[PDB]
Amino acid sequence: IPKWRKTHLTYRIVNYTPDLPKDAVDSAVEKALKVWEEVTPLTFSRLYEGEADIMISFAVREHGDFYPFDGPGNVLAHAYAPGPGINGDAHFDDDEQWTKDTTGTNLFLVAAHEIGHSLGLFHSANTEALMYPLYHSLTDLTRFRLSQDDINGIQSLYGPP
Numbered sequence: 259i260p261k262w263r264k265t266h267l268t269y270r271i272v273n274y275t276p277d278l279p280k281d282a283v284d285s286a287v288e289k290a291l292k293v294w295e296e297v298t299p300l301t302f303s304r305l306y307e308g309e310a311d312i313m314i315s316f317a318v319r320e321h322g323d324f325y326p327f328d329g330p331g332n333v334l335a336h337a338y339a340p341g342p343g344i345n346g347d348a349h350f351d352d353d354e355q356w357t358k359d360t361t362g363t364n365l366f367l368v369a370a371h372e373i374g375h376s377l378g379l380f381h382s383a384n385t386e387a388l389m390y391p392l393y394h395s396l397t398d399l400t401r402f403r404l405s406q407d408d409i410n411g412i413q414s415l416y417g418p419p
């Protein structure tokens with residue numbers, strides 16, 4: 259049961275995708291981190307230089323670690339469980355089309371999902387859970403909220419705020 263031994267994590271957006279403006283990317287990330295920050299003592303802090311606990315980046319096919327990307331479709335991204343170095347990092351396959359709306363793969367939706375892993379959560383059984391295996395969108399992107407199951411999960415590791 260891997261988990262962070264500290265409630266204050268630091269993140270760094272190594273680079274950006276050509277699909278969205280620099281800002282749409284930062285917002286998706288911040289809104290994704292904030293969903294977990296709200297339901298736990300977890301606190302994130304942005305780093306523009308050096309090594310961060312969660313190294314966020316975009317990439318296609320082979321790109322450093324042990325899990326290459328498969329081009330368009332399928333594995334949209336992935337994250338590593340809590341730990342040192344490569345662990346905790348979140349990588350997004352830039353072979354997909356990251357969108358703020360529902361026209362492609364919603365960056366926020368996936369990012370939130372990935373952070374769930376970087377924090378130590380695996381896939382859930384609940385169909386309407388954020389940590390659900392299969393990626394799907396929603397009609398009102400504004401109506402999204404952490405599913406009950408996700409609350410219980412993230413708190414069993416770090417507890418309530």
Ligand SMILES: [Ca+2]
Pocket residue numbers: 310311312313341342343344345346347
């Ligand atoms: Ca790391």
Ligand SMILES: [Ca+2]
Pocket residue numbers: 327328329330331332333334335351353354
């Ligand atoms: Ca893919």
Ligand SMILES: [Ca+2]
Pocket residue numbers: 275276277352353354355356
């Ligand atoms: Ca792309």
Ligand SMILES: [Zn+2]
Pocket residue numbers: 321323325336349
């Ligand atoms: Zn990767």
Ligand SMILES: [Zn+2]
Pocket residue numbers: 371375381391
């Ligand atoms: Zn996943």
